[PDB]
Design a protein around this ligand. Structure first.
Ligand SMILES: NC(=O)[C@H]1CCCN(C(=O)[C@@H]2CCSC2)C1
Ligand SMILES: [Zn+2]
Length: 140
Protein backbone atom coordinates (compact mmCIF):
# COMPACT_ATOMS: atom_id res chain seq x y z
CA UNK A 1 0.00 0.00 0.00
CA UNK A 2 1.03 3.66 -0.27
CA UNK A 3 0.26 6.98 -1.92
CA UNK A 4 1.86 10.23 -3.11
CA UNK A 5 0.36 13.32 -1.44
CA UNK A 6 1.11 16.42 -3.56
CA UNK A 7 -0.96 19.60 -3.25
CA UNK A 8 -4.60 18.56 -2.90
CA UNK A 9 -4.08 15.29 -4.72
CA UNK A 10 -3.68 11.66 -3.56
CA UNK A 11 -1.96 9.39 -6.18
CA UNK A 12 -2.49 5.65 -5.68
CA UNK A 13 -2.31 2.40 -7.67
CA UNK A 14 -5.67 2.17 -9.50
CA UNK A 15 -6.01 -1.47 -8.41
CA UNK A 16 -5.78 -0.40 -4.70
CA UNK A 17 -8.10 2.65 -4.90
CA UNK A 18 -10.76 2.86 -2.16
CA UNK A 19 -14.46 3.80 -2.45
CA UNK A 20 -13.57 7.27 -1.10
CA UNK A 21 -10.95 7.62 -3.91
CA UNK A 22 -13.59 6.75 -6.58
CA UNK A 23 -16.12 9.13 -4.94
CA UNK A 24 -13.55 12.04 -5.09
CA UNK A 25 -11.99 11.11 -8.44
CA UNK A 26 -9.78 13.50 -10.40
CA UNK A 27 -8.27 11.11 -13.05
CA UNK A 28 -7.65 7.41 -13.61
CA UNK A 29 -5.90 5.31 -16.29
CA UNK A 30 -6.05 1.52 -16.21
CA UNK A 31 -3.22 1.18 -18.78
CA UNK A 32 -0.89 2.98 -16.31
CA UNK A 33 -2.31 1.47 -13.04
CA UNK A 34 -2.85 5.02 -11.70
CA UNK A 35 -5.71 6.87 -10.00
CA UNK A 36 -5.75 10.37 -8.49
CA UNK A 37 -8.33 11.58 -5.97
CA UNK A 38 -8.83 14.97 -4.28
CA UNK A 39 -7.85 15.66 -0.63
CA UNK A 40 -9.02 18.16 1.97
CA UNK A 41 -5.51 18.61 3.49
CA UNK A 42 -2.41 19.75 1.53
CA UNK A 43 0.33 17.18 1.03
CA UNK A 44 4.13 17.44 1.41
CA UNK A 45 5.51 15.37 -1.46
CA UNK A 46 6.99 17.20 -4.48
CA UNK A 47 7.07 15.59 -7.96
CA UNK A 48 10.39 15.22 -9.79
CA UNK A 49 10.55 16.92 -13.21
CA UNK A 50 13.68 15.28 -14.70
CA UNK A 51 15.08 12.30 -16.68
CA UNK A 52 16.88 10.52 -13.76
CA UNK A 53 17.36 6.74 -14.19
CA UNK A 54 18.77 6.21 -10.66
CA UNK A 55 16.87 6.66 -7.42
CA UNK A 56 15.66 4.98 -4.22
CA UNK A 57 12.44 3.06 -3.58
CA UNK A 58 10.56 1.89 -0.45
CA UNK A 59 9.99 -1.85 -0.10
CA UNK A 60 7.37 -2.53 2.63
CA UNK A 61 8.05 -6.34 2.60
CA UNK A 62 11.64 -5.58 3.77
CA UNK A 63 11.02 -2.27 5.72
CA UNK A 64 13.89 -0.89 3.63
CA UNK A 65 14.73 1.76 1.05
CA UNK A 66 16.88 0.43 -1.81
CA UNK A 67 18.94 2.35 -4.35
CA UNK A 68 18.13 1.24 -7.91
CA UNK A 69 18.89 1.88 -11.57
CA UNK A 70 15.63 1.84 -13.59
CA UNK A 71 14.61 1.88 -17.25
CA UNK A 72 12.90 4.78 -19.01
CA UNK A 73 9.06 4.78 -18.95
CA UNK A 74 7.92 2.26 -21.58
CA UNK A 75 5.17 -0.10 -22.71
CA UNK A 76 6.01 -3.47 -20.82
CA UNK A 77 4.20 -6.79 -20.76
CA UNK A 78 2.55 -7.56 -17.41
CA UNK A 79 1.41 -11.13 -16.62
CA UNK A 80 -2.11 -11.87 -15.81
CA UNK A 81 -2.98 -11.38 -12.11
CA UNK A 82 -6.12 -11.07 -9.86
CA UNK A 83 -6.10 -7.31 -10.83
CA UNK A 84 -5.48 -7.25 -14.63
CA UNK A 85 -5.53 -9.65 -17.62
CA UNK A 86 -2.27 -10.14 -19.43
CA UNK A 87 -1.64 -6.75 -20.99
CA UNK A 88 0.75 -4.04 -21.66
CA UNK A 89 1.15 -1.42 -19.05
CA UNK A 90 2.28 1.95 -20.24
CA UNK A 91 4.69 4.45 -18.62
CA UNK A 92 6.26 1.60 -16.58
CA UNK A 93 9.95 1.51 -15.50
CA UNK A 94 11.73 -1.69 -14.40
CA UNK A 95 14.57 -2.27 -11.95
CA UNK A 96 16.19 -5.25 -10.26
CA UNK A 97 14.81 -5.44 -6.70
CA UNK A 98 12.55 -7.11 -4.36
CA UNK A 99 8.77 -6.55 -4.93
CA UNK A 100 6.03 -9.03 -3.77
CA UNK A 101 2.41 -8.69 -2.92
CA UNK A 102 1.88 -5.92 -0.35
CA UNK A 103 4.53 -3.66 -2.05
CA UNK A 104 2.48 -1.57 -4.55
CA UNK A 105 2.36 2.08 -3.55
CA UNK A 106 5.90 2.43 -2.23
CA UNK A 107 7.58 5.64 -3.50
CA UNK A 108 10.49 5.76 -5.97
CA UNK A 109 12.36 9.10 -5.59
CA UNK A 110 15.43 10.87 -6.94
CA UNK A 111 17.31 14.06 -5.98
CA UNK A 112 14.47 16.13 -7.60
CA UNK A 113 11.48 14.57 -5.83
CA UNK A 114 8.97 11.70 -6.29
CA UNK A 115 9.43 9.80 -9.58
CA UNK A 116 6.63 7.18 -9.25
CA UNK A 117 5.17 4.30 -7.21
CA UNK A 118 5.69 0.54 -7.13
CA UNK A 119 3.25 -1.10 -9.64
CA UNK A 120 4.88 -4.61 -10.21
CA UNK A 121 7.24 -7.22 -8.75
CA UNK A 122 8.22 -10.94 -8.84
CA UNK A 123 11.25 -12.64 -10.53
CA UNK A 124 13.69 -10.30 -8.81
CA UNK A 125 12.12 -7.31 -10.67
CA UNK A 126 10.38 -4.19 -9.52
CA UNK A 127 8.25 -2.04 -11.85
CA UNK A 128 7.28 1.57 -11.11
CA UNK A 129 4.43 3.65 -12.58
CA UNK A 130 6.01 6.96 -13.63
CA UNK A 131 4.31 10.24 -12.68
CA UNK A 132 6.91 12.79 -13.95
CA UNK A 133 4.90 13.58 -17.11
CA UNK A 134 1.72 14.51 -15.10
CA UNK A 135 2.45 18.22 -14.94
CA UNK A 136 -1.03 19.09 -13.69
CA UNK A 137 -0.21 17.47 -10.29
CA UNK A 138 1.79 20.72 -9.55
CA UNK A 139 -1.21 23.10 -9.92
CA UNK A 140 -4.96 23.77 -9.07
N1 LIG B 1 0.60 -3.40 -12.29
C1 LIG B 1 0.04 -4.60 -12.29
O1 LIG B 1 -0.55 -5.06 -13.27
C2 LIG B 1 0.20 -5.38 -11.00
C3 LIG B 1 -1.15 -5.68 -10.33
C4 LIG B 1 -0.94 -6.49 -9.06
C5 LIG B 1 -0.14 -7.75 -9.36
N2 LIG B 1 1.14 -7.42 -10.00
C6 LIG B 1 2.30 -7.81 -9.45
O2 LIG B 1 3.36 -7.58 -9.98
C7 LIG B 1 2.24 -8.61 -8.17
C8 LIG B 1 2.07 -7.76 -6.88
C9 LIG B 1 3.45 -7.22 -6.50
S1 LIG B 1 4.58 -8.47 -6.78
C10 LIG B 1 3.57 -9.41 -7.94
C11 LIG B 1 0.99 -6.68 -11.24
ZN1 LIG C 1 15.59 13.43 -10.75
Amino acid sequence: SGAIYVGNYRVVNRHLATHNDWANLVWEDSSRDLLVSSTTAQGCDTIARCDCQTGVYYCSSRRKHYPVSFSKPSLIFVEASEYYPARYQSHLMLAVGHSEPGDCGGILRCQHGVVGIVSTGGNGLVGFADVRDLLWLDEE
